[PDB]
Structure formats: C-alpha cells, structure tokens
Ligand binder design. Sequence first.
Ligand code: SAH
Ligand code: SAH
Lengths: 357, 357
Amino acid sequence: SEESELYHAQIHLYKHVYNFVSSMALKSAMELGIADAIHNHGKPMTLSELASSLKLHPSKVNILHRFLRLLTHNGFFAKTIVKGKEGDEEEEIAYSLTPPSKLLISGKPTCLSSIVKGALHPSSLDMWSSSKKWFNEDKEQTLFECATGESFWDFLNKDSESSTLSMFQDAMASDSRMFKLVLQENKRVFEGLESLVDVGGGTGGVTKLIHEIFPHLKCTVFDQPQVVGNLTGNENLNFVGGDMFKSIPSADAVLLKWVLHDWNDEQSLKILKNSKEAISHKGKDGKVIIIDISIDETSDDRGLTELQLDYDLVMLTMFLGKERTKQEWEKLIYDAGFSSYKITPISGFKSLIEVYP
Amino acid sequence: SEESELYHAQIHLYKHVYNFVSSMALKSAMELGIADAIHNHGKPMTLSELASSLKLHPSKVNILHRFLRLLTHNGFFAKTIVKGKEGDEEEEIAYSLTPPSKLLISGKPTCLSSIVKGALHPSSLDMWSSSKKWFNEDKEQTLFECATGESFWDFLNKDSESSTLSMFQDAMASDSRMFKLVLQENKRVFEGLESLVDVGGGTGGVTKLIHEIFPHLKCTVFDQPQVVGNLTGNENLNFVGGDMFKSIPSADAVLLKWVLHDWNDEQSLKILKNSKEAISHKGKDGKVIIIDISIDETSDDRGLTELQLDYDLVMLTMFLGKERTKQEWEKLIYDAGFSSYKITPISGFKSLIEVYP
Ligand SMILES: Nc1ncnc2c1ncn2[C@@H]1O[C@H](CSCC[C@H](N)C(=O)O)[C@@H](O)[C@H]1O
Ligand SMILES: Nc1ncnc2c1ncn2[C@@H]1O[C@H](CSCC[C@H](N)C(=O)O)[C@@H](O)[C@H]1O
C-alpha cells in the first residue's frame, strides 16, 4: 500500500485535467446572456422562463439545465423554490444571480462581458494545439505565432478579422473603464494629494478618469514630445513632453500605470529612481503609485496566486510577456531607495502598489 | 458601498475565466514527458538538467521554468534546494515528482497519460467555439456534431484520423486496465463471494481481470447470444447467452459495470429488478455491484463534485450522454426493492456502489 496509494493522486490529477470545462461553462453563460435575462426579469427566474427568454429550441432546454446546475455549483447562481401556477409546475426551482454573475449584466459600468469574451475567444484557446511543437522548436516566438504563423497583433489587423478586433478593443476599453472603479474604491490613496504626474499617460485618457473622481487634483500628463507635443488645457490638467529615463516632472505623487511590465529591471530601476527624485521635494509626504500585477507566491489565497500565475502564462503564450512577483517588486523598490510599500489588491487579481521614500 | 461591492466578485469571476490555463499547463507537462525525465533521473532534477533531458532550445528554457512554477503551485512538483558543482550554479532549485505527477510516468500500470492526452486533445476542445451556435440552433445533436458536421465516432473512423483513433483506444485500454487496480484496492468487496455474474461482460475481458485478483471466484460472463454464442472454458469461467431484461443468471453477486449509464430509469429499473432476483437465492448474503458515476451534489468535497459535474458536461457536449446523481441512484435502487447501499469512490471521481437486498 505505502507509496502506491492512488485515489488522492487521481482526484487531484483529474481535477486539473477537466478544469477547462468550468471556463467553457462560464463562456456559455455569458454568450447566452443568462445574467441579462434574469436581471431583466428582475425576479428569480424559472428554467422554463429562462428557456423562453433565450428562445431556445425545446431540445436545448435540458442542455440549459445541465449548464445551470454546474454554474450554480460554481457559485454563479442561487437556487430558490417557487410557487407555480396551479394545474402546472407544482414545485419548481428558480435561479437568481450572484455577485460574480452580476458582473455579466451589460449596459453597466461593472460589466466584464467583453473581457471574458476575449479571454475565452478561439484565438486565445486554439493555439494550445501547437504547444508541443512550440516547446521543441528552435525559433523564439509566442505560442500564437508558432500555431498561426503570424503575431497576434497582425492577426487582428487582417481584413477578415474586423470583428475580432472590435471585440478585443471593446475589452481594452472595458478594462480602462474599470480603472474608474478602482479609483472610487481606493480614494484614500489619492486623498491628501495636491498634485500628481501620470507618467506615460499618453493623451490623458487615464488622467481624465482621475479628474472625474478627484476634480481638484493638479494632474500633469507626462509622455514623449510627439505623443503630447501640442495638448493643453485646464488649471488642473497638464501636458509636458520629455523622457522619463532622464527626468520626470515633480509632483506630490508619481503614477506608473502599466509602465513597468514593459521594462526590464534595469530600465525599471531608472524609472523608479527618477520617480523618487520627482517627489523628493515633498519629502516623506510624497509617494510613488505603481499599478501593475504582483504575484504573491507565499500568499494564503492559493486560488488567487494560481489565477495570477494563470494570467501570467497567458501573457507568455500570447505575447511572451511577464508579470513580476511580490519579491522582485520588493527588490526593485528597495534597490531604488524607498523605505516601505503597501500592496492593495484591485480588479480581481491586479495590484496597486504604494511606494514610500 | 453595500451591493456594489466588487473585488470578491471579480476574483471569483476571473478564477473561473482562467481555469483552462491550468489544464493546458498539465497537458504540456505530459506531452513533454517531464515526469518520465525526472523519474529516469531518479533524483530531484535541476532546471538545466531537465532542460537538457528534454533537449529544449535555449530560448525555450525560461518557458519550461514558467510552466514549472505554476505546476509546482498546483502541486505536481516539489521544489528542493541543491548543492551545485563549484564554479557554477551556486544555489539551484531542483524539482521532484508528487503523487499526482507520478501518474504520468509511462510503462507503469498506473500511467494515465493517454487518458489525459485524449481528454485534452484538440478534438475535445475546439468544438467549444460552436457553443453559441449549438445553443441557438433547432437541430438536436452533440456539440461535436454541431461544430464538426459529423458525429465523434465517424470522425475517428475517417482515414485521415488513423492516429487520433489509436490515441483514443489507447485511453480506452488504459481505462479498463485501471479497473484491475480498483479490484486490488477494494478486495473486501468481492471477498466473501463464491460466484459472480458479469452482466454485459461481452467477451469476458473484465472477468479476466477479476480472475487475476480472485482466481477462485466462479465468474459467469453474461451477454447476448451473438456476442457470446460460442466461448467456453475454465471451471471458474462461464459464458451464457441471454437477455438481461428477461432474466440474468443466478450468483452470489451481480456486477453491472458501465451498463446502467446507457439506459433510462425504466430500463435501468428492470435490470436492477432482475439483478435482485438473480441473487435472491443467496438471501441477505447476496449483493449487486454497480460500477458507474455518481454525483454527490451535497458532498463536502466541493472540488470533487465540480470535477464530476465537469466530466458529466463533457459527456453531454461530446455524446449527449448523462451520469446520474447520488439521489437518483438512490431512487433507482430503492424502487427496485433493495434495503441499503454503500458508495465507494474509485478512480479519481468514479464510483463503486454496493447494493443490498
Ligand atoms: N522615455 C519615455 N518617457 C515618457 N513616456 C514614455 C517614454 N517611452 C515611452 N513612453 C510612453 O510609455 C507609455 C507606456 S504605456 C503607459 C500606459 C498608460 N499609463 C495607461 O494607463 O494605459 C506610452 O504612452 C509611451 O508613449
Ligand atoms: N439484453 C441484453 N442482455 C445482456 N447484455 C446485453 C443486452 N443488451 C445489450 N447487452 C450488452 O450490454 C453491454 C453494454 S457494455 C457493458 C460494459 C462492460 N461490462 C465493461 O466493463 O466494459 C454490451 O456488451 C451488450 O452486448
């Protein structure tokens, strides 16, 4: 017996084998618009009612039921027992939305539909059939290039991929929108700030959001001369062109939103150093705000670390990109000269790091 | 704040969105033969050593590392810290197998490679791109037929699918082999039995296994006249042709291995009734043994119920088949007249039901 003790070993194995089914079940739920239907019904909905709302063929009803059962077990729906109308139904089960599923209700600031649709789009999953060829080849490329022949970006730009591109940029907009919510949920981060520099803020889209929640904050959008060049306006809105590797505008705080996952530790350290100098005049009152993923391998929420590692693997297979771990984030901020830092989990699995001198 | 409280809602949502990545990571691990390599090294293996064993290009090494990190987090590998050979390596991490991964070592009775390879084969995953079309169409068919145009079985039989068919029948054999292990791990089930009837035992493949662990048990392979017709041999081996819906041979016990998930409750009840009569002469000493899936929705091992529900969904999308829940198994055995029953979990997520009169 000792050693050759299966079962515990098999349950674990199969559990990971069939994980994909849970994702496909969620995918279906959103592509069918179950949340919108129940929400529009605004009252626990019955299998028949939902079936009728989705205008499903009678043969597809029991398929809806099967998907509902699993999804309910996965916490995307709550089961209720409802009345019935006399000579029919007797005792029937009704379904209600749950916080997780409410995120799938469209026409709402919190809708994450487009994002889940892109994350589970065929162009995101089919490439995996080339994983073995990808591991054993001599060419350095993304798994997407290996399986498709072209890079992900070139694929979207094709003419026969017009719709695919609309979907992904809908997800992109949906992601930048959610930032607004991050601001709303973490006002204490920007509370005692008189000014802020949005490094690599491009045309000022993100600053605009910041201004929607904090109208009085003096924001200076910093980017390259060409990207900013002209642009002006507002007493609290600022556009200055320059090079973040040489110097970044002084302010109460420095925002680095999605600007460090593109640079290596060397280039990232210089940016952090220039960031510390830009707040240097505010002394121990200034702070650097980093918005990027941080994987906490030693976290107690194993599921969250796994989700983070999952995402990181998608960045690898699709773009050959990487996210940093909490420790390498620590090394970076300390090697830059800061005294402490505070990580705040945001948007499911992302992070908001507050760095203090 | 109340109601509009995200985060907890998002972490849950994304966790299910990106579940597929864990499956693809396991898929890679087996297609690369990481377990075989470490096992053949028979000592915790270093990233370099494994990289060299897999003969990976230098550019693919860091990809191996990324996949290893996640898989380790998912418990398929244990990290160790090893020596190093002087002027190189310094302190390097080594990887060891875990019970779950040891299941991937080939040339062993417990190897579940072929099974995981089929379960994660493109012919098993690509069809999901047609899920929306499948839900909204009027034709009753499997998701595989909807996306491919042909049934799963016809696909395997094609000439251009010779290899695909070898893979799936390797998985089938691998599954029937594992039964031998189920027997070894549950001898007390067949311990006090003098005889046994293997209903729908076909040509006696499964009885052969039963005879390997229990040489003295009198087994009578029961099936249709044509499938058995001739076949004879052995004092403890028996072949009798007939119809299980009319009557099944008497014996100390009746085995129903994968024979009930093909019949509806009506046909399944008749088979159970005829099974009770076949052991009727042994009184309260006889038993009916059912080997088929049982989903325990109220189980405390939520993960196992989810895995079972996952599998059940694959049977739906690929064959339009179904597995039963523990309660509907209960209704069946009680409506047949039995007094009690005992469910024993086997092979990861399957079940072995012992039914008593
Ligand atoms: N030397 C440099 N100085 C300042 N900005 C630079 C730079 N090199 C590149 N960039 C800018 O880096 C930005 C990276 S993208 C930054 C993302 C942005 N804050 C968001 O929320 O989406 C680009 O807008 C690019 O123009
Ligand atoms: N009326 C009947 N009586 C007995 N066997 C029947 C039958 N109708 C169909 N079968 C048999 O039902 C079996 C279902 S498959 C049973 C699976 C088998 N015990 C295993 O371990 O793989 C077939 O072998 C088929 O020949």
